[PDB]
Amino acid sequence: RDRVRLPSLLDKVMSAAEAADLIQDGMTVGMSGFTRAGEAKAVPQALAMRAKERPLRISLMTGASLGNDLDKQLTEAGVLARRMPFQVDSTLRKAINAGEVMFIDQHLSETVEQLRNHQLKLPDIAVIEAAAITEQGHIVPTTSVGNSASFAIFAKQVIVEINLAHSTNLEGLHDIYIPTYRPTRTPIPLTRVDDRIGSTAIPIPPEKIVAIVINDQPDSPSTVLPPDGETQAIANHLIDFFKREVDAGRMSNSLGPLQAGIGSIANAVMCGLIESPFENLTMYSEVLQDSTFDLIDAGKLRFASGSSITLSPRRNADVFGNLERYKDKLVLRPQEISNHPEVVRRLGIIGINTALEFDIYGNVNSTHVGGTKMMNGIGGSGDFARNAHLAIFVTKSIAKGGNISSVVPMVSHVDHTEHDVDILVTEQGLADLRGLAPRERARVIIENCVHPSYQAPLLDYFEAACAKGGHTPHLLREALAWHLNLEERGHMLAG
Amino acid sequence: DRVRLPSLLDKVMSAAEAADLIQDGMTVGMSGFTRAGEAKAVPQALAMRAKERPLRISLMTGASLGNDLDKQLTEAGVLARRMPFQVDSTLRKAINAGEVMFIDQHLSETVEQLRNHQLKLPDIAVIEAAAITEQGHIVPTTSVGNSASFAIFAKQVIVEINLAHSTNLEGLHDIYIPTYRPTRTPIPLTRVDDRIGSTAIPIPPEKIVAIVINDQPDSPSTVLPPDGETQAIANHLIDFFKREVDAGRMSNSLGPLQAGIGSIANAVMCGLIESPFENLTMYSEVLQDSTFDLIDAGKLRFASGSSITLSPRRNADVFGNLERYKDKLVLRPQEISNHPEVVRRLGIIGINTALEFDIYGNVNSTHVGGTKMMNGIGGSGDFARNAHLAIFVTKSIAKGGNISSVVPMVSHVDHTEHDVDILVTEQGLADLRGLAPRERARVIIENCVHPSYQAPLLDYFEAACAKGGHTPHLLREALAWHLNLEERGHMLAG
């Protein structure tokens, strides 16, 4: 009654099990959920349980990754034929790397564009987590928007999962906006980070709602680690860089609208900005993490836009227990709009995203171990990096006790070509790549970012490659040898 | 005449005199985009005077230069740096020898970097012009490229009036500069023929420091007539477009078309004359012979570009009778012809040429053997990333079969598989839409690869799958074809 404000919809209230029985073999399902936030839970749990009794296969699209071990449960029950666009789940990841589940990682802003222009098969049914349903039958989401507005609109049928664990005071937080349609599309009329251009609920005709399921279950919390000496060193290198830019008249003291990637390094790098002279910041990001709220509390961050909010347990309790402290400083948008090239380039975003590895020519791998093994997906990193005022990628310089260098002669897999990378940072230092040719980037990368264990070997590769010439020097015999050495002998330097 | 603000006649001087204003250490921003609309006399004089009295400069253009200008400047030892795109075998050699620093940028992005303190400004602009207006504003010639921005950024401007381009070019250009951050508003372009700017480049005439009179045609386009192979590529693509239209997934007017520079893409566009598609529009970077063939055929309504570069007779025919075409054309800054905001808004169908691509859909546009630069990524990334359909084409083999254009892994990624929808060779077409990597590999091997490479590539794929992964590879073998080509002159010679 506070939750379902269109009383006639109460006839569609049913069990998670009854709702899941509406999903059958061969269907495409569009579901809410973005980096643990705002996902349907009871329906997919029920779906996975059911599939162990009698099996089926679906194609599943989300906003991004799911928590609550949902991908694990779906994968183990054999439910997933096809999965997109992003997942964080070691069981699913294993299935994908064994060819058992077809995975398509897409630039996070682009899936709904493909759907709306006939390039991608539409969802048959949308399963959307909600804080409330309005008097008009329109859906108020919870802790993320992600792709849910497009999924609800495109799908022939909608399941709404009302989650009592999220307050009805989330209403107002969201700005649901769908671009106008080709061949006569008009501009996305956003010019400031806090513009409201849409509505607070996802507007659909309520006749297409086929089930309302009542649930009460929290989001899985963010698992970001506390900052350590290395992430602190990364933040300090980056701060020094911004200080040089400001003192040079190339940037102001409020920097630029900030986007920070999902995960501990990027979150830790953002926390690092509390110890800095920078004032009156804004964020135009895809995910909002603990660091968003640390920055607001420090008085540094004026406003943050995102698609998804994902917090550690206490911070989550603090924010959503005391929402009115933050509500005027936040907005949640569809991930298409939080990541939109037109908006990213209009605003001049400063994007800070984490690399799995990068090479001496500035190319970045965000996804594949040894060029073959998928981790999670390219996510929004390409939406921001391509169009950003500054595209910054960060990573510790080594992994596995030194056995792996995060800086290599040639990346095993390219997610961002060197054209979309401006600044690279490890605990060792920072490589400013702006205006530099390939041979110039290599000397700066090797000097600044590479671990002492790998510096001489990487310089030897570069110098021997240069002897063979080219705009972008390589030894075709050796370009991928570190990756092969790791795989065959357990250390990149074991020849 | 021509110099419609009489007080500027003051600044008229020889190419040599004007070239002496360019000083050692300077950044120079020049007009010129794939042979069209470049300054000619001033850079040639620069090169001449250099080999008596060195300097060194950093040269920025719209894109590539004709008239062997890059060659002359390279040989005179003038180029310390060069960006963003070049087509010149002498310069390419220097770049590959580390003698000139080359930065290939996405073509829409250079001016964005310049305006937001991310790249050194030009000290001096050198701009070819059809006329200077009553207000001292510059009417460009056969391209806009980066010339509006260069003239505006630079402290000093050298204008080279070229009598070989008619003053009736005025009206062709729509010079638009975006509003600046942090208060930037949208680019108000929603249709292919929108006029959002001015017909001349607005500068205060006081910045004009020299006017040089020249009379010299642009170097003509080197596009070749279509052969059996480019025809077969055009035909695979037309069959695909037909299937889409037939299935209700596309209109009979396709989408606004972008066609890359060079013979294959131009030949594909000519292919559309022999097709059922009607009322086309183009929103492209360069406009080539095929643009005008398509208009003459009554297929193409309107074309927007940044640059027009034609064959010698087509050139004579078009600019000999511009009134035939003027209402169907517009030229825009390359920032705006290629702008991500416009490309995605309009839903461009982009057709660009690959050097090579791989079984996972990645495209190399620039590097031979992963190391040797050809010309530059150009606009292919601006379009491919943001297009409704990103289509890449190439003949399946080269060098009499010694080279496959379809390889296990590209030696150099310019476009990740995220920006590639459709791949086409004379062998067939691979529709990659919604496909996972292993699915892409099967479709590409079946459809695009030459009979003589099909089984080696399938063997690679099948063997790579045994080691597992979302994107299976053999690390020992992934680059072996490129090594084989280099060591032994044939990709299959191990």
Parallel/antiparallel/unpaired status of strands A58-61 and A28-31: parallel
Question: What residues of chain B lie within 8 A of the CB of A302, using their CB?
Answer: none
- B109, B112, B285, B426: the catalytic one is B285
Contact between A419 and B104 using a beta-carbon 8 Å cutoff: yes
Q: Rounded to the nearest 5 degrees, what angle is found at the Cα of A168, between the Cα atoms of A167 and A171?
A: 120
Tell me how the structure was determined.
X-ray
Among residues A264, A306, A311, the alpha carbon closest in space to that of A290 is found at: A311
Chain-chain contact of A479 with B482 (C-beta, under 8 angstroms) = no
Instruction: Annotate A22-52 with b (16+ C-beta within 10 A) or e (fewer).
Output: bbeeeebbbbbbbbbbbbbbbbbbbbbebbe
Inter-chain residue contact B371 with A189, CB threshold 8 Å: no
DSSP string, B252-293: TT-S-EEE-SSHHHHHHHHHTTSSS--SEEEE-SEE-HHHHH
User: Hey, are the CB atoms on A104 and B370 less than 8 Å from each other?
Assistant: no
Name chain A contacts of B438, Cβ cutoff 8 Å. Answer: 99, 102
- Is A357 in contact with A411 (CB distance < 8 Å)? yes
User: Is B486 part of the contact surface with chain A (CB cutoff 8 Å)?
Assistant: yes
Q: What is the DSSP string of A407-456?
A: EESS-SS-SB-GGG--EEEETTEEEE-TT--HHHHHHHHHHHTS-TTTHH
Please report the sign of the dihedral spanned by the C-alpha atoms of residue A211, residue A213, residue A219, residue A220: negative
Smallest Cβ–Cβ distance between A480 and the set B98, B118, B478 belongs to B478
Kindly determine whether residue B98 and residue A378, on different chains, have CB atoms separated by under 8 Å.
no
Per the structure block, which two tokens stand in for B276?
Answer: 């059922």
Decide if B479 and A483 are in contact by the 8 Å CB cutoff: no
Residue of B nearest to A369 (CA): B469
Distance of CA A265 to the CA centre of its chain: 13
Running DSSP on this structure, what letter comes out for residue A227? P
Residues of chain B contacting A484 with CB distance shorter than 8 Å: 475-476
Measured distance CA(B418)–CA(A11) in Å, rounded: 44
Residues in chain A with CB shorter than 8 Å from the CB of B381 are 417, 419
Is residue B448 within 8 Å of residue B406, measured between CB atoms? yes
- Which CA distances in Å does B120 have to A433, B26, B455? 13, 10, 50
Q: Is A193:A329 a contact under the CB 8 Å cutoff?
A: no
Closest CA to B283 of B306, B304, B262: B304
User: What residues pair up with A351 in beta bridges, in sequence order?
Assistant: A259, A391
**Catalytic: B160?**
no
- CA–CA separation, B394 vs B320, rounded Å? 34
Q: Give the number of C-alpha atoms closer than 13 A to the C-alpha of residue B33, restricted to the C-beta side.
A: 33
Q: Does B468 touch chain A (CB under 8 A)?
A: yes
Q: For residue A184, how many other CB atoms are within 10 A of its CB?
A: 9
Tell which of B185, B243, B281, B371 to mutate to test the A interface (max A CBs under 10 Å). B371
Q: Which of A291, A281, A420, A289 is nearest to A345 (CA)?
A: A420
**What is the residue-wise DSSP string for A465-492?**
HHHT--SS---TTTTTHHHHHHHHHSST
B345 touches chain A (CB under 8 A): yes
Q: How far is CA A249 from CA A282, A347, B117, in A?
A: 20, 19, 9
| Farthest-apart Cα atoms in chain B, separation | 77
In whole angstroms, what is the distance from residue A442 CA to residue A450 CA?
A: 11
**Rounded to a whole number, what is the distance in Å from the CA of B240 to chain A's nearest CA?**
13
Spell A475-490 as b/e; 16+ CB within 10 A means b.
Answer: bbebbbbbbbbbbeee
- The DSSP code for B467 is T
A72 in a labelled binding site: no
B 236-275 near A (Cβ less than 8 A): 244, 248-251, 255
B269: nearest Cα among B237, B239, B312: B237
Q: What tokens appear for B294 in the block?
A: 């398509």
Evaluate whether B33 touches B143 at the Cβ level (below 8 Å): yes
On whether A30 is known to bind a ligand per the annotation, the reply is: no
Q: Roughly what angle, to the nearest 10 degrees, separates helices A264-271 and A290-297?
A: 10
Q: Does an H or E element contain A89, and which?
A: none
Residue A345's closest CA among B150, B389, B377, B184?
B184
Among A198, A68, A77, A207, residue whose Cα is nearest residue A129: A68
For this experimental structure, what is the resolution in angstroms? 2.1
- CA–CA dist A318, B254 (Å, integer): 53
Among the listed residues A14, A20, A82, A13, the one whose alpha carbon sits nearest the alpha carbon of residue A45: A20
Q: Please say whether the dihedral angle defined by the alpha carbons of residues B67, B68, B72 and B77, taken in this order, is positive or negative.
A: positive
Mutation to test the B interface, candidates A372, A392, A439, A462, most B Cβ within 10 Å: A372
**Between the CA of residue A472 and those of A119, A136, A182, what are the distances in Å?**
36, 60, 40
Q: Min CA distance, A94 vs chain B (Å)?
A: 9
